Write a protein that binds this ligand. Sequence first.
Ligand SMILES: CC(C)CCC(=O)N[C@@H](Cc1ccccc1)C(=O)O
Ligand SMILES: [Ca+2]
Ligand SMILES: [Ca+2]
Ligand SMILES: [Ca+2]
Ligand SMILES: [Ca+2]
Ligand SMILES: [Cl-]
Lengths: 358, 366
Amino acid sequence: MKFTVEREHLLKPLQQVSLPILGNLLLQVADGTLSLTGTDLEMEMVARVALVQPHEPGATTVPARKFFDICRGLPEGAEIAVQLEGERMLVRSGRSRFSLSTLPAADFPNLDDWQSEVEFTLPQATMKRLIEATQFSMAHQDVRYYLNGMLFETEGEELRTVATDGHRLAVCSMPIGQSLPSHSVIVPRKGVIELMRMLDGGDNPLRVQIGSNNIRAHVGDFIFTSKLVDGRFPDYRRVLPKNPDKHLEAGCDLLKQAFARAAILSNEKFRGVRLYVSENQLKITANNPEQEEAEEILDVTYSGAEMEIGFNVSYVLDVLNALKCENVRMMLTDSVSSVQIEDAASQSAAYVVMPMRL
Amino acid sequence: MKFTVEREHLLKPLQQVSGPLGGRPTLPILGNLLLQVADGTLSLTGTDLEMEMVARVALVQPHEPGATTVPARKFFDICRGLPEGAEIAVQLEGERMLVRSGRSRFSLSTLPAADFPNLDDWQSEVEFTLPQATMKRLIEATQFSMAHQDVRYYLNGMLFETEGEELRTVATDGHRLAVCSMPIGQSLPSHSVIVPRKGVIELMRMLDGGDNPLRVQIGSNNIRAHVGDFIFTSKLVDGRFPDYRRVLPKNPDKHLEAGCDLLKQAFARAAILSNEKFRGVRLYVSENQLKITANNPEQEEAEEILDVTYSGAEMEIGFNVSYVLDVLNALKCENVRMMLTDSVSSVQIEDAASQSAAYVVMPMRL
Ligand SMILES: CC(C)CCC(=O)N[C@@H](Cc1ccccc1)C(=O)O
Ligand SMILES: [Ca+2]
Ligand SMILES: [Ca+2]
Ligand SMILES: [Ca+2]
Ligand SMILES: [Ca+2]
Ligand SMILES: [Cl-]
């Protein structure tokens, strides 16, 4: 295996792809192409680079971080020459020389072959919107493994994401402009994070392939694959309040800043605030073990019956930070029922949050 | 005690005087700021018992005198969290201090101003003014070489030395040393004092970057710095710092000069394949050439060849590459001079264009 390539052409590929052998990148030269693969057994990223300079086919594996750091550490405009010599891989550029250890390409974990069942293309921006709208509501290390991740659901012409931790839920639906089969899978949180990471903000569309046990995403000359998670993910439709009769509308940023200020004097371990809704007004209060008190009064749009209800501060701020909008609607039922929160100008996403007793 | 101040006039003072406060204040009052209204000025003070930072805020709105202490983090977060240009009205009510702005209201627990720790009065024995940039240069040139939580307590601070028309800082951890001298244009008596770790941090923190000069006062047991409307005071560390003059190699007759960035980037790349704990690289110096090598127990190898200026005898010497990189990062210059003796002796490293800063690094046993 031998190739010479500009550092420039390796930088982005290495960034995306980076048991001892799982700390190594697979390098493969074949058919005028260098392929680079990184994996952790649960997911893999493959990147390809074209090779115009003389090259020789073959494959080996090398320490991912060290190889990346060496390539990154070389000067801008550097040419990187690589040749395989037994148990070492030689890397040369200018008068900088490196010998890295290797493990055989034959030993490299190959994620089992699988079969695509559902396929579609969508804009990068749509995937970004879907993930950012809901990712914060995924569970972290819940014993219910299937909540430590994100539901991806196809229905009609929409792709939908759902995330929940049992206390709050986020759902977002976006058009993809193709009639799609009804289907849903759970992508583990680490997979969701890497999927987000591969979206660079340009116009490259994403090609998605969903199998019975895997999901794959193609963008540019990168291919990402992740295993899926087994489980009965809850139905968001059953979580949405059936008949909210009390409607508050307020400035998103005004509400966010009032919550954030009040939270300063809430209990440090379980930060919550009490809301009192009455005619044209929201009052937010907090107190702590030291008997310190905060109070915020806001002029709001509200005409239903008076009620008091508590919320976990972080759950509400998480939603308001996700909304990034002018006005927010809160749809309430009673003091012991969950609340629905939405951007007043968008029906693409909805949030449900349990009340908190204080 | 009463005052009303616009938000943005409080924020930076609050941030500044909170400098010395830790997370986990050992006792409640140490997490509080002293607020004092007197003679048309609000003063803010934070302390950790070793040093204090004080800010003076002019009061253009109606006020009443008095003093209390309140939780620093809560009070700052409240002020920061209010809308831009918010008028922050404060009224003391015994065990509580009330804060109001628009329709936002807050009640904070207080502790008596009379219990707030107050550094003893002391007497200045030397005073001088210097540009903020000069103090910045002095600290940045040497701070990285200070020890971290060493049982030899004096090493955890920074020596400040006045001598003739020069102010000098020195830092060392026993393995490597940094010294920087700068001119002040005022003839100073000889003083040598150790500023504690957090004190060095605060001195740096208070340099706004503008043209407000720094006024320094040093006593036998304290140091004080005045910048704008801030006054920083620290107790000095009670120890005898090593003399840097005795640590500088006596006659290194082997001189190497090379570009700083090329040397840095080569050391940085070589470091990748050095031992993860010991970080050893080897330097082979020969006529007009430096070869840097690293290897690790994975029997991986790095080699960097650099054109340098060197006329001395060939020699091989090992170094902790982190120590070398730290120096090169601190020098931030075009060319560097390395002054060598032998493979069992320290190297002296300097900007090739200025002797104002010098660095002494002990070699590694190969
Ligand atoms: C977010 C919260 C208001 C959902 C409460 C709820 O409807 N829980 C159901 C479904 C569910 C939702 C989220 C996680 C797990 C289960 C249950 O406990 O069975
Ligand atoms: Ca090329
Ligand atoms: Ca991977
Ligand atoms: Ca459905
Ligand atoms: Ca104002
Ligand atoms: Cl003011």
